[PDB]
Write an enzyme that holds these catalytic residues in place. Structure first.
Site, PDB file in Angstrom:
ATOM      1  N   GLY A   1       5.007   0.162  -2.091  1.00 57.54           N
ATOM      2  CA  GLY A   1       5.501   1.505  -2.413  1.00 57.54           C
ATOM      3  C   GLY A   1       6.823   1.549  -3.148  1.00 57.54           C
ATOM      4  O   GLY A   1       7.573   0.570  -3.120  1.00 57.54           O
ATOM      5  N   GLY A   2       7.099   2.676  -3.813  1.00 56.68           N
ATOM      6  CA  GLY A   2       8.320   2.813  -4.641  1.00 56.68           C
ATOM      7  C   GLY A   2       8.900   4.110  -5.209  1.00 56.68           C
ATOM      8  O   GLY A   2       9.925   4.015  -5.904  1.00 56.68           O
ATOM      9  N   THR A   3       8.306   5.286  -4.940  1.00 57.86           N
ATOM     10  CA  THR A   3       8.873   6.588  -5.386  1.00 57.86           C
ATOM     11  C   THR A   3       9.832   7.092  -4.293  1.00 57.86           C
ATOM     12  O   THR A   3      11.054   7.194  -4.506  1.00 57.86           O
ATOM     13  CB  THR A   3       7.774   7.629  -5.751  1.00 57.86           C
ATOM     14  N   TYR A   4       9.262   7.398  -3.126  1.00 58.90           N
ATOM     15  CA  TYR A   4       9.999   7.556  -1.832  1.00 58.90           C
ATOM     16  C   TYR A   4      11.052   6.464  -1.530  1.00 58.90           C
ATOM     17  O   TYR A   4      12.139   6.759  -0.995  1.00 58.90           O
ATOM     18  CB  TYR A   4       9.025   7.669  -0.627  1.00 58.90           C
TER      19      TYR A   4
ATOM     20  N   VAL B   1      10.100  -0.687   0.677  1.00 60.22           N
ATOM     21  CA  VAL B   1      10.035  -0.918   2.133  1.00 60.22           C
ATOM     22  C   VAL B   1       9.811  -2.400   2.418  1.00 60.22           C
ATOM     23  O   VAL B   1       8.816  -2.982   1.961  1.00 60.22           O
ATOM     24  CB  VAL B   1       8.948  -0.070   2.825  1.00 60.22           C
TER      25      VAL B   1
ATOM     26  N   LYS C   1      13.508   0.830   4.999  1.00 59.99           N
ATOM     27  CA  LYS C   1      13.228   1.595   3.774  1.00 59.99           C
ATOM     28  C   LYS C   1      14.507   1.685   2.949  1.00 59.99           C
ATOM     29  O   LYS C   1      15.440   2.393   3.335  1.00 59.99           O
ATOM     30  CB  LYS C   1      12.700   2.999   4.126  1.00 59.99           C
TER      31      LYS C   1
ATOM     32  N   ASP D   1       1.248  15.430   4.198  1.00 54.70           N
ATOM     33  CA  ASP D   1       0.672  14.192   3.631  1.00 54.70           C
ATOM     34  C   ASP D   1      -0.148  13.351   4.619  1.00 54.70           C
ATOM     35  O   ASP D   1      -0.121  12.111   4.600  1.00 54.70           O
ATOM     36  CB  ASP D   1       1.774  13.343   2.945  1.00 54.70           C
TER      37      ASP D   1
HETATM   38  C1  LIG Z   1       2.304  -5.510   7.907  1.00 46.57           C
HETATM   39  O1  LIG Z   1       2.694  -4.137   7.774  1.00 46.57           O
HETATM   40  C2  LIG Z   1       2.350  -3.334   6.711  1.00 46.57           C
HETATM   41  C3  LIG Z   1       1.570  -3.770   5.614  1.00 46.57           C
HETATM   42  C4  LIG Z   1       1.256  -2.905   4.555  1.00 46.57           C
HETATM   43  C5  LIG Z   1       1.707  -1.592   4.586  1.00 46.57           C
HETATM   44  C6  LIG Z   1       2.481  -1.143   5.665  1.00 46.57           C
HETATM   45  C7  LIG Z   1       2.834  -2.000   6.732  1.00 46.57           C
HETATM   46  N1  LIG Z   1       3.599  -1.602   7.865  1.00 46.57           N
HETATM   47  C8  LIG Z   1       4.575  -0.600   7.946  1.00 46.57           C
HETATM   48  N2  LIG Z   1       5.035  -0.260   9.163  1.00 46.57           N
HETATM   49  C9  LIG Z   1       5.969   0.672   9.340  1.00 46.57           C
HETATM   50  C10 LIG Z   1       6.494   1.365   8.227  1.00 46.57           C
HETATM   51  C11 LIG Z   1       7.520   2.416   8.417  1.00 46.57           C
HETATM   52  N3  LIG Z   1       8.466   2.343   9.376  1.00 46.57           N
HETATM   53  O2  LIG Z   1       7.528   3.372   7.663  1.00 46.57           O
HETATM   54  C12 LIG Z   1       5.996   0.996   6.923  1.00 46.57           C
HETATM   55  N4  LIG Z   1       6.482   1.597   5.754  1.00 46.57           N
HETATM   56  C13 LIG Z   1       5.867   1.616   4.485  1.00 46.57           C
HETATM   57  C14 LIG Z   1       5.396   0.454   3.839  1.00 46.57           C
HETATM   58  C15 LIG Z   1       4.812   0.528   2.576  1.00 46.57           C
HETATM   59  C16 LIG Z   1       4.708   1.755   1.930  1.00 46.57           C
HETATM   60  C17 LIG Z   1       5.188   2.906   2.552  1.00 46.57           C
HETATM   61  C18 LIG Z   1       5.771   2.844   3.811  1.00 46.57           C
HETATM   62 BR1  LIG Z   1       6.400   4.456   4.568  1.00 46.57          BR
HETATM   63  N5  LIG Z   1       5.077   0.021   6.874  1.00 46.57           N
HETATM   64  C19 LIG Z   1       1.387  -0.639   3.457  1.00 46.57           C
HETATM   65  N6  LIG Z   1       0.143  -1.008   2.763  1.00 46.57           N
HETATM   66  C20 LIG Z   1      -0.134  -0.068   1.668  1.00 46.57           C
HETATM   67  C21 LIG Z   1       0.132  -2.411   2.288  1.00 46.57           C
HETATM   68  C22 LIG Z   1       0.410  -3.432   3.411  1.00 46.57           C
END
Ligand SMILES: COc1cc2c(cc1Nc1ncc(C(N)=O)c(Nc3ccccc3Br)n1)CN(C)CC2
Ligand SMILES: COc1cc2c(cc1Nc1ncc(C(N)=O)c(Nc3ccccc3Br)n1)CN(C)CC2
Lengths: 289, 285
Positions: free
Chosen positions: B19-22, B25, B40, B131
């Site tokens: 991710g990258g607009t918000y 992470v 984040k 969302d």
């Molecule tokens: C092994 O953990 C993860 C693998 C992946 C993803 C997410 C997680 N975990 C994960 N846990 C908690 C948060 C949080 N505190 O917000 C978070 N944030 C996040 C991450 C990416 C974008 C947006 C956001 Br908000 N992410 C996102 N997927 C699209 C691809 C792989």
């Protein structure tokens, strides 16, 4: 309607670029034999855009004939490119003018406002909304006459329409009322009247109110309950009738705000001696200081 | 309490999550204790107000709801806010279903209950999620369900700059037009609709109309005789799941049930809904 499936570069020589961005490019063009100056709006078309309903807007543009709205001459559709041939307004926008001339006189502003309101009264009776009354979008021909553009059919297709979708994001999870607002906004007809109120101050002072203040801060101020609308800075320079025109046009409550028709019977804009001579004096000031 | 300090002193940034607009992470380790967090990073710009920024952070700190991703702290190094949060190690349900295939009705019912518990909390705090979708419902290693929070991150940085760019100069804009340009048509009950569609998404690997163009979908939704979506395969799902989809996908917002009302619905009030259902899913991997 009759969109001619032909190259418009055959029929017109493109002279000079006038502007553009998202909607597409606008050129000054000469009619090759007859020497008539036109405005050619080149619109970027994309493969998932319906050609059937596109003609019905062009039919509304053809059957429309209001004087304060820029005249539609015709359409061409060459290689994934809609070209809208239109009236040319040779002095540019009022923004282009005021940046050289400085501030307009009260009479000049009063004439502009009357001509815009005549345009807005027509668009609202046709159930349309301008959405974008500002100095930069009020055009001035060499005769001193006042023309609004029309971003009606250009909004319904192409790269400006794709821009409006991109910020909205994937719509699949979105509820109907959320999608309804994502199309419309808060835009109703009466927001054009407010916008004219701001435009009249802009013409008066070379800037809309709060132009030096951050966009977000302005959005939050506007929405908070005790927002006082803007006013003209210099009370003594302007007549009471101009102040009242600004007061009533800038009514916060949309239910209580006067319509374009109601506004045309206002003192400022119903006064005699408002004619294109006032703008010819302005265009003379652009040439001769 | 925004700590004016470098968070890279306190945590090792391990791996980017996406991710990258918000914001961007990262998965981060607590340097001594070895505790896993989600950091984040938001790129800030100089005209963002720090005063009201702390009041959202105060609500985030005093908040302790289980179905919302936990807030641990904020750090502000060189024009970069870093928001330290709970880690959910299995990713989103989208990341999961793209490997596992479709969730069972029981698994979906558990997810729905946990989301509605989160939404019931957010709406009582006068907030709206905006969302609800598979990609934003996160799953930890325990099999538990957490909603993300794009709340304070939306009010600053490059996502805030994007929201201003499309809106355009506000100076000529009327108050009612500006009001709608900030809020949208988002009220609290749109999250319930969105969960309705999410339940179908989890059921079928796609939201309804996923092969139809965004614009066409927007116009269809708004036109007067719009039938809401339904599940494709009537026999595979129980009548209670069909009713959950029917009532959550009520077009009229006034008639559409709230999160609290929905938690006492049959599908999500049934016994035997627990994290074991998701442990089976995470085991399918
Ligand atoms: C092994 O953990 C993860 C693998 C992946 C993803 C997410 C997680 N975990 C994960 N846990 C908690 C948060 C949080 N505190 O917000 C978070 N944030 C996040 C991450 C990416 C974008 C947006 C956001 Br908000 N992410 C996102 N997927 C699209 C691809 C792989
Ligand atoms: C000498 O004529 C002009 C000089 C200048 C400007 C405009 C004009 N005339 C002009 N006449 C007619 C139209 C029309 N039929 O729509 C038009 N449209 C337009 C132009 C730019 C953008 C969008 C649009 Br719609 N423009 C605009 N300024 C920004 C720079 C100078």
């Amino acid at each position: 309607p009759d969109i001619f499936n032909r190259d418009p570069r055959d029929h017109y020589d493109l002279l000079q670029r006038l502007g553009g961005g998202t909607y597409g490019e606008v050129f000054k063009a000469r009619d090759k034999v007859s020497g008539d100056l036109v405005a050619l709006k080149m619109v970027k078309m994309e493969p998932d855009d319906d050609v059937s309903t596109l003609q019905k807007e062009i039919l509304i543009l053809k059957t429309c004939r209001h004087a304060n709205i820029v005249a539609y001459h015709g359409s061409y559709l060459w290689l994934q490119k809609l070209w809208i041939c239109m009236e040319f307004c040779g002095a540019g926008s009022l923004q282009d003018i005021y940046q050289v001339t400085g501030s307009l006189s009260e009479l000049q502003i009063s004439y502009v406002c009357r001509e815009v309101l005549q345009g807005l009264a027509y668009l609202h009776s046709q159930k349309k909304i301008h959405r974008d009354i500002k100095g930069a979008n009020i055009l001035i021909n060499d005769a001193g006459e006042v023309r609004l553009a029309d971003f009606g059919i250009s909004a319904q297709i192409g790269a400006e329409l794709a821009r409006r979708l991109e910020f909205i994001g994937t719509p699949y999870w979105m509820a109907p009322e959320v999608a309804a607002v994502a199309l419309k906004g808060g835009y109703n007809e009466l927001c054009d009247i407010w916008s004219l109120g701001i435009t009249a101050i802009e013409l008066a002072e070379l800037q809309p109110p709060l132009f030096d203040v951050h966009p977000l801060r302005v959005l939050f101020l506007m929405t908070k309950s005790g927002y006082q609308p803007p006013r003209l800075k210099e009370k003594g320079k302007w007549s009471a009738a101009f102040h009242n025109f600004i007061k009533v046009t800038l009514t916060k409550s949309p239910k209580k705000r006067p319509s374009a028709t109601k506004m045309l019977s206002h003192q400022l804009v119903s006064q005699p001696g408002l004619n294109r001579g006032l703008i010819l004096d302005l265009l003379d000031k652009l040439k001769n200081p």
